[PDB]
Each structure stands twice: as structure tokens, then as C-alpha cells.
Amino acid sequence: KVFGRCELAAAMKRHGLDNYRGYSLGNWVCAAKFESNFNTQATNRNTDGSTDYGILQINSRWWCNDGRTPGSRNLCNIPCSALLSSDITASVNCAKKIVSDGNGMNAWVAWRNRCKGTDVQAWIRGCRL
Length: 129
Fold this sequence. Notes:
Elements: H1 5-14, H2 25-36, E1 43-45, E2 51-53, E3 58-59, H3 89-99, H4 109-114
Helix pairs in contact: 1-2
PDB class: hydrolase
Keywords: Lysozyme, Hen Egg White Lysozyme, Allergen, Antimicrobial, Bacteriolytic enzyme, Disulfide bond, Glycosidase, Hydrolase
Assembly: monomeric
């Protein structure tokens, strides 16, 4: 599923990401935007053989099991496939864990490089939240 910006904001909020670990919804939308362009099915192989999955490009290196990332953890205890669901619950729950991992949203490279410090509120601008 390719979410619309506000649609995703709503879903994220719906799954309690708004302000989660102090990251306003715009941050999460912004991260989603640059991680997956809001496409829940986004998968991207990392140089190291791990793959990032889903709307928030959660990496199998740590967070989900895709059965092909040697030495990886599966800290969200989910198959990475669950992270590609049109329903973002798994991605959110996993993102919640990730963003609690100690580096906050810096875990999301795109967020650090593209969202952090920016007017992330623009991402939810106009959304009926």
C-alpha cells in the first residue's frame, strides 16, 4: 500500500506513534516518506545483506527476521514480511522498539539526513489527524 501523507499520519497516530519517544507525527511521516515513500511494500537490500522492510525500512540486521540475514537479530520478533503489510501495526510496533533503542530516530538514516531538524510539521500540515 502506498499511503497518502495524511493517511499515513492518521494511521501512525492511530497506532500511537504521534509523539512516541517524543517524536512528533511529522517526524515519523517524514521518515516514512524518505524511507519508503509511504509504500508499505518497500524493501531495499543493504550492502551487508540485510534488507530494510516496509514503510519505515526496518532492517532485518536487527529488527525482523527475513531468514537471510546471517547473524541478524529479530528484535521486533516478527518476520520482516509483516513489515510490508498494508496495515502498519507491525511496522509501528517495531519502529517503537527501534526508536526506543537509544538513538531515537537517528536509527533511520533517511530521517537523520532528511527529516531531522527540518520543519517536519509540514508532513502533517493540513491533515485531519
